[PDB]
RNA sequence: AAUUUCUACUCUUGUAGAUAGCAGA
DNA sequence: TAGTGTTTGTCGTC
DNA sequence: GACGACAAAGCACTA
């Protein structure tokens, strides 16, 4: 097995896109015939027909729901039993019962069953079949069910073109399917409305039994309105009536028995919805509801469990406090011997149940009520102060955009507040409160959608990428390149002087007309035309044209002699009866031999069948020319799989023949041919440099090597698109103006966005104002250029453009899908223990950081990827963008940041693949399922980086390096295939081919010399008793006079209540308060050893500002003040406890806080070092400021190193494992135990 | 500030990387 | 009594 | 029992 052998394993399909430039006067001919305008109208017709078909989509659904008659007694009993006993058996019984009822409704739409009489059951299938076919426009489906003339004229607009609704058919299948999917009609009937209707019947009978006078009163309300005249009030609250509550008109009548593109568009619509909130007085109603909570019974006001953690973080210290406070109070009221099983039951109960507001107050204290009152009035005042604040006149200025966002934040804040309360009727909700809350709520739901629509408008770009597909009045345009379908499709390609041209033949005067392109000698100058020959598949096309056609099937049925085929045959073929009988556990198939076992009959029949196929190919009118003599005789063919896989590549072929330029130019001159040059900036006159990957795929497809031996196949079903211009604001660099580079003299540090505009205006002498102080300072550093030629901003969308989306297939000689790809990778890895690793982590001072390690674990190379292609993406560019978002906090700045991150990550995968191929390594990412990263990290968690991993998997599916020759492995003809096909984020686990995913947590805050981690969670120390109990668990803390350090011995079998439950290896540790000394690094720079950056400034705000702190110096100073003598080397902790100085104990613990903190960062001073608190086996505490290459350089370096180290643990278990499998993730304790043992 | 277009850019009338489209969210 | 402008074929997995 | 990929086979229109 070789690493270069990971190619040609499965087919990968990519569709290239190009721009079509009209040649000669083909644009004039198109405009004269009005093809673009007609196709533009077809786009509008397709969109205007979107609800018309959806309307004729209800008719059928409404008609099918009118005949539904079911007995809902069984469904009610399954609902009652699940509410009665909360066991998993009654849940699965209800899930199956619901699925049975959903299918009962589905059988009315398309039953294909025996429950409904076929007279009716089969009639629905004839409609549902062509509900996703042409029938829609035939009027046939409407003939089964009245169309108006304009609607009839709209249906015929898609005659011979109903494939335009291809994707729309899928969107309508997503509406039915009769699954638990909420989008479906059966689900809405069974699982949404019936539990509501079933509850209505129970509410009815309880009221009528207690207050019988309410019966005649309800009956009078029904009679006074006029609804359900043939049904009494008791029957509408009985199960049989629900069958007549399945259509909207009946649902509306039932509910009424109960109830009785532009800038100013966002201002007019919002102000219309905004002024509607005053008339409804939703603020006054909301302010009155939250004021009711001061006196009403709070044991029936429930908080949703999905919001409890969010509320805890908004009203308390952490997200933990509420869930923990409820946990302690519930453990406080358990019965008998409180086992650890009873505690876990209380934990699991708090995850998925709604807590009433009273139990929260009784468990958290009176300080939550003050937080609840203050937060409620704060949100209500902001929403009240925003409804009366008028919107601006326009959105031209950013100051006017800010007030629009500010008022939307207040509206979304109130909308967020209302979603705190549980909506489900499973809880005993208050009568009046739940009704008034659900009312103002139903009203605030479009705010969220409206808010999202508004934010996207600000994020939107001034372009209009919207486009429509050009058909040229052909439903099969560019649907196939075969020469025999020249007229049928009318799309061919030309190559001339390295420039690729597309030629489409229009219907000449409304009729098909072939062009007699005469093959001219190659010497004469002219275009080269593609001759495309293709036989789709031997398995499906051969029987269709030879033994399964209408002629021979009927002939063999009514006549028992072989028949001769003459049409589409050079020499007549004598198809005989037996081979058709074989094709009538099919015969000559693997199943037949597996079951029957007639091996002798198999080999003879297959020999005749294979010979018959070989007989067919040499006799067919188009397959006779291809040289099939390379095929082996039928005696040594095992089965059809190997034979068809061998026969298929021989059929497909592309050849080029020169066509004289005079014919092509005259064809364009008269208008018979439309010439479109393919253009992707790699065919420009001034082009110089390595081209795009898509250009190489296009260039490599037509290379002489590929034509002789196919590895890139030109797939059919190509598409043409036309994009209208979007010239609304043209910016240009006119001649005589002075360009300004976005980078300084070093062409690596970008100018801030705000400063760049001011400098650019001053350079051109256009700014009326004066430059800032920092603008003057940065002025000499910028570089200016004169405009030699005009550069048009966004020139792509200035004018109208054509497009050509063409699909190609790479690795055409491989299988359709990979077959156990991970087994192949694991096989290579097992035989190659020396395969290096590549660990990638998201640092804070570095966007993406890399570290490669070998089998033994030494760091071969570690690099920071924030500087790609001589440009700084983090140290300068992302910092300025983050500065702007912290200054303005607008929507445009957020959109630019997300686009930059995705663009930066595109550059990263090139660095990864270039690094990986050079080392022949395996790259280990981190799975997003486990853990999270802080806000200080440069990439948002599970939002952009999750898509980053998708790109890396997809890129390595068909990895092609653009500096490589095509013939060797890794080129365009033989791409690398190192990853399995991506299916979903959930399905990918710990391996995706040559990619590994190890748990993120417990990777970057570890000493790389001892494997030590901070074993104490500091949230368990709050009071003096906790501090003293924590401090008394240690063994001994003493001054070493020889070295000047403090050795704080600790045994992991102590302070369990303050620990994190991960002992790991090394049951004892020696925390060292390193003596501060001006140590020198490799470069000789001075740095003080043991320096720690502590952010603790206030009890509530623990990261107000970073503060310098020296654990050794401060603790010596603290002990001197207390009068403690410690130079004798005696233990210090017992003497600390006996004096019982509250301030000294707090300082004692706070210093242990600092020393156990390894990752010390300071953005202002540029320090991101990591310092070990414990000594290694050599006896030296790790300090990353030493800049030793063999160990991580900075804090971000440590994380990428251990992700690669976590990759070793996966492979180390892989090598020793007998099976070719991997563990379903790495336990945090198991990883800690492994690393702590290895570093020793 | 020039792109099948996405990001960044301007020694180079263009550079470096990415780029599986259509339809529907 | 024909030019010409939707149907069918499956092999393996799934 | 359920998916496909592009051709050549059919199949209805007027003639």
Complete DSSP assignment for A871-930: -BIIIIIIHHHHHHHHHT--HHHHHHHHHHHHHHHHHHHHHHHHHHHHHT-EEEEEETTS
| Residue closest to sugar C1' of B16 by CA | A869
- How far: A619 CA to C2 C1' (Å)? 27
Tell me: is residue A510 an annotated ligand-binding position. no
Residue A467 near residue A459, CB atoms below 8 Å: no
Q: Quick check: helix, strand or coil at residue A659?
A: strand
Tell me: is residue A49 an annotated ligand-binding position. yes
Strand C nucleotides, any atom under 7 Å to a protein CB: 4-14
Residue A718 near residue A804, CB atoms below 8 Å: yes
A795: which nucleotide lies closest, measuring CA to C1'? B2
Number of Cβ atoms within 10 Å of the Cβ of A148: 8
Q: Quick check: helix, strand or coil at residue A840?
A: strand
| Residue closest to sugar C1' of B7 by CA | A903
Backbone angles phi, psi at A1049, to 5 degrees: -70, 145
Q: Residue A715, CB, less than 7 Å from strand D?
A: yes
Name every residue whose Cβ is closer than 8 Å to that of residue A775 and which is 6 or more positions away in sequence.
Answer: A755, A758, A759, A762
Contacts made by residues A1123-1130, CB under 8 angstroms, sequence distance 24+:
A1126/A1038, A1126/A1039, A1127/A1039, A1127/A1041, A1129/A1038, A1129/A1039, A1129/A1040, A1129/A1041, A1130/A1038
Strand B nucleotides, any atom under 7 Å to a protein CB: 1-25
- How far: A64 CA to D14 C1' (Å)? 39
A1079 forms beta bridges with A1087
Structural tokens at position A4? 């270069």
Looking only at the bridges linking them, the beta strands covering A849-853 and A738-744 are unpaired
Residue A30 near residue A813, CB atoms below 8 Å: no
3-state secondary structure A198-223: HHHHHHHHHHHHHCCHHHHHHHHHHH
State the Cα–Cα distance between residues A447 and A443, nearest whole angstrom.
8
State the Cα–Cα distance between residues A110 and A245, nearest whole angstrom.
21
Structural tokens at position A491? 């799309």
Residues 797-836 of A with CB under 7 A from strand D: 807, 809
Q: After which residues is chain A broken (C to N over 2.5 A)?
A: 145, 260, 584
Q: Quick check: helix, strand or coil at residue A106?
A: helix
Cα first-last separation, chain A? 35
Could you give the angle at the alpha carbon of A997 between the alpha carbons of A995 and A999, nearest 5°? Answer: 165
Residue-wise DSSP of A1138-1204: HHT-HHHHHHHHHHHHHHT--B--BTTTTB--BEEEEE-SSS-EEEGGG--TTS-SSHHHHHHHHHH
Burial bucket for residue A493 (CB in 10 Å: 0-12, 13-18, 19+): buried
H/E stretch holding A351 reads helix A340-351
H/E stretch holding A1039 reads strand A1036-1039
A159: which nucleotide lies closest, measuring CA to C1'? C5
Name every residue whose Cβ is closer than 8 Å to that of residue A582 and which is 6 or more positions away in sequence.
Answer: A588, A605, A609
- How far: A467 CA to B21 C1' (Å)? 14
| Residue closest to sugar C1' of C12 by CA | A641
Dump strand ranges (E) for A940-980. Answer: none
A1174 forms beta bridges with A1071
- How far: A897 CA to B5 C1' (Å)? 18
Q: Identify the experimental approach.
A: cryo-EM
Residue A1199 near residue A843, CB atoms below 8 Å: yes
Structural tokens at position A1113? 């110096």
Residues 455-514 of A with CB under 7 A from strand B: 461, 463, 465, 469
Best CA proximity match to A683, nearest among A694, A695, A668:
A695
State the Cα–Cα distance between residues A774 and A783, nearest whole angstrom.
16
- How far: A10 CA to B25 C1' (Å)? 31
Total residue length of chain A: 1240
Structural tokens at position A286? 């909301």
Residue A129 C-beta-side C-alpha neighbours within 13 Å? 9
Tell me: is residue A1051 an annotated ligand-binding position. no
Tell me: is residue A693 an annotated ligand-binding position. yes
Tell me: is residue A536 an annotated ligand-binding position. no
Residue position matching structure tokens 């098909």:
A512
Best CA proximity match to A908, nearest among A925, A920, A933, A921:
A925
Q: What is the DSSP letter of A502?
A: E
Residue A141 C-beta-side C-alpha neighbours within 13 Å? 25
Helix-helix angle A753-763:A879-887, to 10 degrees? 100
State the Cα–Cα distance between residues A698 and A763, nearest whole angstrom.
43
Number of Cβ atoms within 10 Å of the Cβ of A557: 9
Could you give the angle at the alpha carbon of A535 between the alpha carbons of A530 and A540, nearest 5°? Answer: 155
- How far: A579 CA to C8 C1' (Å)? 20
- How far: A892 CA to B4 C1' (Å)? 26
Tell me: is residue A74 an annotated ligand-binding position. no
Residues 35-54 of A with CB under 7 A from strand B: 50
Q: Please give the positions of A annotated as active site.
A: 733, 742, 793, 841, 926, 1159, 1196
Tell me: is residue A50 an annotated ligand-binding position. yes
A714: which nucleotide lies closest, measuring CA to C1'? D6
State the Cα–Cα distance between residues A144 and A134, nearest whole angstrom.
14
Structural tokens at position A885? 């978002």
Could you give the angle at the alpha carbon of A523 between the alpha carbons of A522 and A529, nearest 5°? Answer: 30
Exposure class string for A876-914: b at 16+ Cβ within 10 A, else e? bbbbbbeebbeeeeebebbbebeeebeebbeebbebbbe
| Inter-CA distances, A426 with A353, A422, A536, A547, Å | 10, 9, 59, 64
- How far: A1189 CA to B12 C1' (Å)? 38
Residue A547 C-beta-side C-alpha neighbours within 13 Å? 22
Backbone angles phi, psi at A959, to 5 degrees: -60, 120
Looking only at the bridges linking them, the beta strands covering A995-999 and A922-927 are parallel
| Residue closest to sugar C1' of B18 by CA | A906
Burial bucket for residue A457 (CB in 10 Å: 0-12, 13-18, 19+): middle
Residue A562 near residue A575, CB atoms below 8 Å: yes
- How far: A791 CA to B2 C1' (Å)? 5
3-state secondary structure A1066-1086: CCEEEEEECCCCEEECCCCCE
Structural tokens at position A953? 């998997």
State the Cα–Cα distance between residues A866 and A850, nearest whole angstrom.
11
Q: Quick check: helix, strand or coil at residue A323?
A: helix
Residues 698-717 of A with CB under 7 A from strand B: 717
Question: How far does CA A376 lie from the centroid of its chain?
Answer: 35
Best CA proximity match to A128, nearest among A176, A65, A184:
A176
Structural tokens at position A90? 């009654």
Name every residue whose Cβ is closer than 8 Å to that of residue A440 and which is 6 or more positions away in sequence.
Answer: A280, A282, A285, A286, A289, A418
Residue A138 near residue A219, CB atoms below 8 Å: no
- How far: A548 CA to D10 C1' (Å)? 13
H/E stretch holding A719 reads strand A719-723
Residues 798-827 of A with CB under 7 A from strand B: 801, 803, 805, 807
3-state secondary structure A611-654: HHHHHHHHHECCCCCCCCCCCCCHHHCCCHHHHHHHHHHHHCEE
Tell me: is residue A142 an annotated ligand-binding position. no
Residue-wise DSSP of A978-1036: -SPPP--TTT--SBSSSEEEEE-SSSSSS-TTT-----B-GGG--SHHHHHHHHHTS-E
Q: Residue A159, CB, less than 7 Å from strand D?
A: no
Could you give the angle at the alpha carbon of A1212 between the alpha carbons of A1206 and A1216, nearest 5°? Answer: 155
Could you give the angle at the alpha carbon of A346 between the alpha carbons of A341 and A347, nearest 5°? Answer: 95
| Inter-CA distances, A547 with A469, A569, A570, A580, A839, Å | 39, 14, 17, 6, 58
Residues 153-182 of A with CB under 7 A from strand B: 167-168, 170-171
State the Cα–Cα distance between residues A137 and A131, nearest whole angstrom.
10
State the Cα–Cα distance between residues A116 and A121, nearest whole angstrom.
5
A134: which nucleotide lies closest, measuring CA to C1'? C6
| Residue closest to sugar C1' of C9 by CA | A540
A837 forms beta bridges with A853, A922
Residue A606 near residue A599, CB atoms below 8 Å: no
Question: How far does CA A364 lie from the centroid of its chain?
Answer: 39
Exposure class string for A1174-1196: b at 16+ Cβ within 10 A, else e? bbbeeeebbbbbbbeeebbbbbb
Helix-helix angle A879-887:A891-919, to 10 degrees? 160
Tell me: is residue A688 an annotated ligand-binding position. yes
State the Cα–Cα distance between residues A612 and A616, nearest whole angstrom.
6
Residue position matching structure tokens 């699965």:
A92
State the Cα–Cα distance between residues A364 and A323, nearest whole angstrom.
10
Burial bucket for residue A959 (CB in 10 Å: 0-12, 13-18, 19+): buried
A642: which nucleotide lies closest, measuring CA to C1'? C11
**What does the longest C-alpha to C-alpha distance in chain A come to?**
119
């Amino acid at each position: 097995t070789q690493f270069e052998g990971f190619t040609n394993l499965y087919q990968v399909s990519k569709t290239l896109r190009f721009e079509l430039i009209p040649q000669g006067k083909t644009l004039k001919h198109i405009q004269e015939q009005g093809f673009i305008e007609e196709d533009k109208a077809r786009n509008d017709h397709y969109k205007e027909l979107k609800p018309i078909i959806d309307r004729i989509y209800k008719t059928y659904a409404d008609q099918c729901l009118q005949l539904v008659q079911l007995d809902w007694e069984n469904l009610s009993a399954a609902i009652d039993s699940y509410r009665k006993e909360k066991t998993e058996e009654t849940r699965n019984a209800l899930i199956e019962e619901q699925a049975t009822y959903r299918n009962a409704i589905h059988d009315y739409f398309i039953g294909r069953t025996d429950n409904l009489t076929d007279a009716i059951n089969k009639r629905h299938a004839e409609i549902y079949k062509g509900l996703f076919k042409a029938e829609l426009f035939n009027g046939k489906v409407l003939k089964q069910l009245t169309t108006t003339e304009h609607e009839n004229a709209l249906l015929r607009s898609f005659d011979k073109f109903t494939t335009y609704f291809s994707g729309f058919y899928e969107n309508r299948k997503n509406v039915f399917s009769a699954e638990d999917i909420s989008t479906a009609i059966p689900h809405r009937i069974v699982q949404d409305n019936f539990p509501k209707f079933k509850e209505n019947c129970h509410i009815f009978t309880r009221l009528i039994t207690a207050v019988p006078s309410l019966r005649e009163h309800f009956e009078n309300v029904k009679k006074a309105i006029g609804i359900f005249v043939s049904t009494s009030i008791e029957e509408v609250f009985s199960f049989p009536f629900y069958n007549q509550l399945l259509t909207q008109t009946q649902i509306d009548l039932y509910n009424q028995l109960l109830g009785g593109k532009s800038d100013e568009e966002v201002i007019q619509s919002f102000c219309k919805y905004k002024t509607l909130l005053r008339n409804e007085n939703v603020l006054e109603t909301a302010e009155a509801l939250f004021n009711e909570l001061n006196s009403i019974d709070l044991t029936h006001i429930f908080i949703s469990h999905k919001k409890l953690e969010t509320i805890s973080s908004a009203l308390c210290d952490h997200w933990d406090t509420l869930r923990n406070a409820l946990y302690e109070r519930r453990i406080s009221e358990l019965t008998g011997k409180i086992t650890k099983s009873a505690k876990e039951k209380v934990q699991r109960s708090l995850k998925h149940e709604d807590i009433n507001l009273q139990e929260i107050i009784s468990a958290a204290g009176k300080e939550l009520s003050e937080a609840f009152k203050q937060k409620t009035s704060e949100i209500l005042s902001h929403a009240h102060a925003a409804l009366d604040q008028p919107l601006p006149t326009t959105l031209k200025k950013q100051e006017e955009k800010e007030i629009l966002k500010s008022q939307l934040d207040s509206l979304l804040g109130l909308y967020h507040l209302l979603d705190w309360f549980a909506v489900d009727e499973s809880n005993e909700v208050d009568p009046e409160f739940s009704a008034r809350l659900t009312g103002i709520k139903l009203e605030m739901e479009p705010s969220l959608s409206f808010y999202n629509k508004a934010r996207n408008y600000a994020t939107k770009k001034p372009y209009s990428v919207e486009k429509f597909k050009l058909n040229f009045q052909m439903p099969t345009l560019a649907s196939g390149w075969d020469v025999n379908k020249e007229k049928c499709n009318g799309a061919i390609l030309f190559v001339k002087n390295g420039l690729y041209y597309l030629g489409i033949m229009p219907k000449q005067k409304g009729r098909y007309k072939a062009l007699s392109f005469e093959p001219t000698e190659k010497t004469s100058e002219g275009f080269d035309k593609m001759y495309y020959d293709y036989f789709p598949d031997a398995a499906k096309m051969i029987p269709k044209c030879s033994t399964q056609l209408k002629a021979v099937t009927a002939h063999f049925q009514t006549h028992t002699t072989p028949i001769l085929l003459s049409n589409n045959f050079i020499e007549p073929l004598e198809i005989t009866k037996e081979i058709y009988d074989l094709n009538n556990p099919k015969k000559f198939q693997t199943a037949y031999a597996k079951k029957t076992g007639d091996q002798k009959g198999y080999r003879e029949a297959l020999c005749k069948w294979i010979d018959f196929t070989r007989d067919f190919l040499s006799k067919y009118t188009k397959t006779t020319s291809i040289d099939l003599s390379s095929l082996r005789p039928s005696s040594q063919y095992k089965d059809l799989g190997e034979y068809y896989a061998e026969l298929n590549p021989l059929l497909y072929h592309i050849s080029f023949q020169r066509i004289a330029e005079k014919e092509i130019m005259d064809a364009v001159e008269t208008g018979k041919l439309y010439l479109f040059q393919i253009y992707n900036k790699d065919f420009a006159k001034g082009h110089h440099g390595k081209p795009n990957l898509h250009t190489l795929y296009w260039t490599g497809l037509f290379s002489p090597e590929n034509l002789a031996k196919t590895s890139i196949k030109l797939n059919g079903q190509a598409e043409l698109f036309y994009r209208p211009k979007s010239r609304m604001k043209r910016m240009a660099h006119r001649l005589g103006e002075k360009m300004l580079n976005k980078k300084l003299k070093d062409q690596k540090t970008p100018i801030p966005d705000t400063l760049y505009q001011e400098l650019y205006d001053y350079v051109n002498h256009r700014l009326s104002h004066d430059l800032s102080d920092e603008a003057r300072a940065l002025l000499p550093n910028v570089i200016t250029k004169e405009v030699s030629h005009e550069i048009i901003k966004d020139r792509r969308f200035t004018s109208d453009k054509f497009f050509f989306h063409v699909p190609i297939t790479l690795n055409y000689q491989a299988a359709n899908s990979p077959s156990k790809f991970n087994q192949r990778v694991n096989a290579y890895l097992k035989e190659h223990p020396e395969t290096p690793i590549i660990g990638i982590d998201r640092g804070e001072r570095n966007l993406i950081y890399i570290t490669v390690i070998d089998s033994t674990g030494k760091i071969l190379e570690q690099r920071s990827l924030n500087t790609i292609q001589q440009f700084d993406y983090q140290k300068k560019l992302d910092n300025r963008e983050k500065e702007r978002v912290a200054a303005r906090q607008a929507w445009s700045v957020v959109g630019t940041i997300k686009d930059l991150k995705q663009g930066y990550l595109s550059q990263v995968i090139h660095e990864i693949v270039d690094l990986m191929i050079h080392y022949q390594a395996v790259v280990v990412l981190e799975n997003l399922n486990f853990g999270f990263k802080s806000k200080r990290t440069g990439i948002a968690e599970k939002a952009v980086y999750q898509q980053f991993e998708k790109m890396l998997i997809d890129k390595l599916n068909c990895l092609v390096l653009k500096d490589y020759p095509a013939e060797k492995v890794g080129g365009v003809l033989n791409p690398y295939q190192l990853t399995d096909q991506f299916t979903s984020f959930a399905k990918m686990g710990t391996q995706s081919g040559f990619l590994f995913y190890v748990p993120a947590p417990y990777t970057s805050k570890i000493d790389p010399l001892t494997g030590f981690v901070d074993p104490f969670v500091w949230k368990t120390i709050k009071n003096h008793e906790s501090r003293k109990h924590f401090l008394e668990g240690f063994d001994f803390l003493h001054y070493d006079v020889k070295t000047g350090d403090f050795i704080l011995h600790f045994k992991m079998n102590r302070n369990l209540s303050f620990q994190r439950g991960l002992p790991g290896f090394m049951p004892a540790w020696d925390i060292v308060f390193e003596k501060n000394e001006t140590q020198f690094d490799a470069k000789g720079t001075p740095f003080i050893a043991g320096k720690r950056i502590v952010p603790v400034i206030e009890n509530h705000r623990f990261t107000g500002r970073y503060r310098d702190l020296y654990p050794a110096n401060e603790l010596i100073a603290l002990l001197e003040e207390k009068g403690i003598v410690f130079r004798d080397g005696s233990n210090i902790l017992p003497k600390l406890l006996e004096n019982d100085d509250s301030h000294a104990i707090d300082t004692m613990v706070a210093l242990i806080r600092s020393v156990l903190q390894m990752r010390n960062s300071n953005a202002a001073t540029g320090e991101d070092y990591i310092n070990s608190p414990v000594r290694d086996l050599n006896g030296v505490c790790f300090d990353s400021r030493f800049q030793n290459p063999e160990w991580p350089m900075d804090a971000d370096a440590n994380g990428a190193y251990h992700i690669a180290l976590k990759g070793q643990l996966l492979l180390n278990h892989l090598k020793e494992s007998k099976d070719l499998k991997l563990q379903n993730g790495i336990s945090n304790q198991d990883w800690l135990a492994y690393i702590q043992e290895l570093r020793n």
